[PDB]
Amino acid sequence: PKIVNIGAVLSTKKHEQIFREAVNQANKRHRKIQLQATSVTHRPNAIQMALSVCEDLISSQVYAILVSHPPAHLTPTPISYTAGFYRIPVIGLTTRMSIYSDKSIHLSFLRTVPPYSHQALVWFEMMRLFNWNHVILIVSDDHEGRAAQKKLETLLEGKPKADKVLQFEPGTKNLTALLLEAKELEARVIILSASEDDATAVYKSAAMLDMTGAGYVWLVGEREISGSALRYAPDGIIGLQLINGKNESAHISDAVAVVAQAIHELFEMENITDPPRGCVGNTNIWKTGPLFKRVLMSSKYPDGVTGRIEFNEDGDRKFAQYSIMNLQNRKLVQVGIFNGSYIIQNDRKIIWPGGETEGTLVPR
Amino acid sequence: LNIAVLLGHSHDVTERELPLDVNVVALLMNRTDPKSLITHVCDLMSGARIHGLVFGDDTDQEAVAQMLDFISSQTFIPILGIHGGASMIMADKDPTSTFFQFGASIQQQATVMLKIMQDYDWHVFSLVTTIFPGYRDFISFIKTTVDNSFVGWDMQNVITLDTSFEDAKTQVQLKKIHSSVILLYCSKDEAVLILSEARSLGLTGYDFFWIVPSLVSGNTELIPKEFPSGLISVSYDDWDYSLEARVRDGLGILTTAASSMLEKFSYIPEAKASCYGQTPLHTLHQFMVNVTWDGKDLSFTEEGYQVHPRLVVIVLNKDREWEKVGKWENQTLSLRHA
């Protein structure tokens, strides 16, 4: 029974205990492998974090490293680079930024949560539900804005020609000209993809041109109905909330289950080398590093606490579930869920921006 | 004012080369791992107060440039990738970083590969790529250039291999090839398994022409036994470009950006205090983007690579040596038949 170490970089010591428990339960499930848990909390600065990945995690010969956030999100980057140096898989548990979907910079990175850009999957399904064929997409000119635009246009091109895109520089509080252009294009359904600070600026300028009321439908994601943006969001807006997106323990026990299942499916093969023992003197990659990454991404773990766990071609989580939230009288109301492939109605009625009220459709 | 130079073992160690006084620090090390890279730059930053780093490498690890980009955005130290894995272009430079490389983008390399085929009238070719990062940019630049040009090429549908280690799957995909010229895009570790599999199928003999970018050739001093004789590659690992000349270009870029920053601002940014234990107002970012040295354009793009890199077409002879057979670098044209 050889030991296989699993690394982790978690938020608190309380979560390290949960990480050790999940690996302990994974060992109960039963080649015989003894999984061992090795973890640290986040370091002060990124440099010390990278060094702690070498000295505390890679020095223990970890086959993978689970990464969440610190307490009070681009923090997994120092872990991604250092462990990606040897092609050691890095499973992100919290971050939803789209820069981690670029394998040219984060080749060895996976995620149990989907990036914000994959919210366009739900936008695409509501366009099929309501038979919407002309939408206006307003995105910020940044990595997250382009990724949301590209994912939406891909799903539409699988049938341009159905959406018009308007981009704005982040940090700009003067969206008057951009929004007047949206009006000139006969805008009815507007899809907004921006940060909390940027979405707030869009809403305030939208109320300027009387576009927060009747005659308009606002489809947004999670950041656009979070914090400051919610205070200025128009009544009747429809946003998304990733189910279990912020529950670190749920993704700790789900990632452990996927890694454990993938470790045993890996050792069924031949010519398997051990991960590097430390950083100093080791310059070549882990020989079976890329193979293990292909084994993880090909994994299918349907019995997951966060639903079915499959991974994108870029390592992003598939079959994630969202809550379709509709702002009614300054209060967010769940009018249905996207259960990974379809939309489920749930017995409430959507309140459109204004007075018109309707259900989560499925009918004329 | 204070610049450090880190290299690998070979002929080395003789130290030094406008208003600034340049104190060059020359150290050598055989270890190029994340901890060794961070420690050396931080130890170098903590003693000597360095304003810029010239780093050269002797490996195939593309992730060295990944670490130097990270170190440069955490210490605010301008770092120049000179040779080896430090100069391999993969990831875009971080916007806040000041890490630039003596390398060529994939679009610049495919420009050279198409000019080669146009000269030898190789209008028929196949495209063989893996799912390795960069392959979608590779296919796009080749499809658009072929469709936009008037050379009237014939291009087989792109053959894509999802997993290396494929065994039969690689063999099934390589059988779809029905062209004499083959453009292969994959990593150097992936090329070993693919070209060794293509040799068993009788596809690597002088009957065929395999053209690979610098990702496959990598370091010109490390040639795997699975690479076939007659392999054509476009790389920026010029053997004629000396390490002494490269570090001179590295020093020339930093000193020019230093005096230029000493003319617009009255001071040079002091080096950070320490890497451990606990931001600059102005950096040399805008001063080393465009810099000319000894009649050579050493400008960098915002993505990190050079605007006018020294591309070189190399061939692999039966003696298992790369032979410089062409040069693209002069006046935007490929001069072959060397």
């Epitope: 010591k13 205990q17 050790r20 909390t41 010390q48 060094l51 702690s52 | 451990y276």
Partner: antibody, heavy 119, light 100 residues
């Protein structure tokens, strides 16, 4: 590689002050904590306290408050243990142990410093 | 505070047998329970996080360190440390002797 070398043995009369050094090597200082453990001759292991190395914040135990001060250099990678008003009950071997994470287990110990408070 | 009480002070094991040393805590400390080995005239050495012949089991308030195949080099003192709350306390120690 990773080592902890403490200062040599000391001999002090009752009522003086001594400073024990703990020089660390082979790892990133300010990434761990330093624990100080006391062991009387053949009389078990007793915990004195620890000090965060990133933030020089000491944490003394109840039995070792008042006459014990934790200190460090961070440039020489050295942790210090100073004991004032020496009594006869202080004659013991004093180990420094690195705290994994901070507040984790003690994964690396020094060789120990033998202190003798006799007249 | 919290006192760590180790069940057998001394043990004499035949080379190759399997010995289990116990460590009971007054209060529950979850899994923050470490094991140290101190050979004669040496500093303590960390054994178990929460070798290759040493294994750890137990949780809550009662734990156990087991040596599957005892080796002659295993002679010495074995302490268990509470690392769950301040102040951290050690056990009374277990002296391991080997039959011969």
């Amino acid at each position: 590689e990773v080592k902890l070398v403490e200062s040599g043995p000391e001999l002090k009369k009752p009522g003086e002050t001594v400073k024990i050094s703990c020089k660390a090597s082979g790892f990133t200082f300010t990434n761990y904590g330093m624990n100080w453990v006391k062991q009387a001759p053949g009389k078990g292991l007793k915990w004195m306290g620890w000090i965060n190395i990133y933030t020089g914040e000491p944490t003394y135990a109840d039995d070792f408050k008042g006459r014990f001060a934790f200190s460090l250099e961070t440039s020489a990678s050295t942790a210090y243990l100073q004991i004032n008003n020496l009594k006869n009950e202080d004659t013991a071997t004093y180990f420094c142990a690195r705290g994994y994470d901070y507040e984790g287990y003690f994964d690396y110990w020094g060789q120990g410093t033998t202190l003798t408070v006799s007249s | 505070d919290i006192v760590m009480t180790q069940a057998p002070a001394t043990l004499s094991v035949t080379p190759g047998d399997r010995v289990s040393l116990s460590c009971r805590a007054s209060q529950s400390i979850a899994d923050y329970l470490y094991w140290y080995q101190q050979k004669s005239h040496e500093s303590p050495r960390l054994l178990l996080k929460y070798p290759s012949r040493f294994s750890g089991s137990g949780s809550g308030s009662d734990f156990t360190l087991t040596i599957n195949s005892v080796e002659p080099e295993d002679v010495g003192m074995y302490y268990c440390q509470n690392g769950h709350s301040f102040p951290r306390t050690f056990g009374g120690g277990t002296k391991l002797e080997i039959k011969r």
